């Protein structure tokens, strides 16, 4: 039993999922990866959606794990294939395979496109240092002229 969470493009419902049955009705990176791990390790598997719809965490009061990690420790599922981050608290509790993907904490911003000119940018294909030097040259040559 391979438990996973719905995330794009990790796990997705095919447009025909109403008609499709079982493992066939899920498409995604994680799905193909499940196929590969199964083909290499030679087992038949059940693709399942996590009941809590959460990855993992420990309730502060009860100390009980939630989501797929909980599915793993408490024995609702045999394996976890999903965008699951390796952390210390999780590693203590379950065994992690070597990382199959690299990620980092990164910044997403809006794209400025065409409509935002950045007048300063068009005023400075030359570096601000060059402007410093050219003003200094302007006043210096001005005093040499006077």
């Amino acid at each position: 039993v391979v438990t996973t969470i719905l995330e794009s493009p990790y796990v997705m419902m095919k447009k025909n999922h109403e008609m499709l049955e079982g493992n066939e009705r899920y498409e995604g990176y994680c799905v193909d990866l499940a196929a590969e791990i199964a083909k290499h390790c030679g087992f038949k598997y059940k693709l399942t959606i996590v009941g809590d719809g959460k990855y993992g965490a420990r309730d502060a009061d009860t100390k009980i794990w939630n989501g797929m990690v909980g599915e793993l420790v408490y024995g609702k599922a045999d394996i976890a294939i999903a965008p699951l981050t390796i952390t210390l608290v999780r590693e203590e509790v379950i065994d992690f395979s070597k990382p199959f993907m690299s990620l980092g904490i990164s910044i997403m911003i809006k794209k400025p496109q065409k409509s935002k000119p950045g007048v300063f940018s068009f005023l400075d294909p030359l570096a601000y240092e060059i402007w410093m030097a050219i003003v200094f040259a302007y006043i210096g040559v001005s005093v040499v002229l006077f």
């Binding site: 294909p125 570096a127 060059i130 030097a133 210096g140």
Partner: protein, 78 residues
């Protein structure tokens, strides 16, 4: 570590620990870009503006200055 060893799992936990508190990053920065002889490492990333570097125009600035100095000399001889 050797297969079946006792130290592998706790040193693993240790690696995760260090990485989560940013120790590994600090170490790499220390032995790579901190001791870097060339310097301006993070510059080439953050400072890559393409555009124009002051260094190229610098020479023109120097022939301008030297021209002003020769102009000073010629001003003296007049």
């Amino acid at each position: 570590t050797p297969k079946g060893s006792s130290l592998g799992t706790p040193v693993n936990l240790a690696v995760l620990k260090l990485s989560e508190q940013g120790v590994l990053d600090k170490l790499k920065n220390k032995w790579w870009y901190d001791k870097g002889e060339c310097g301006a490492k993070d510059s080439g990333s953050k400072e890559k503006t393409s555009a124009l570097s002051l260094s190229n125009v610098a020479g023109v600035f120097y022939i301008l200055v030297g021209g002003l100095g020769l102009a000073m000399l010629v001003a003296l001889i007049e």
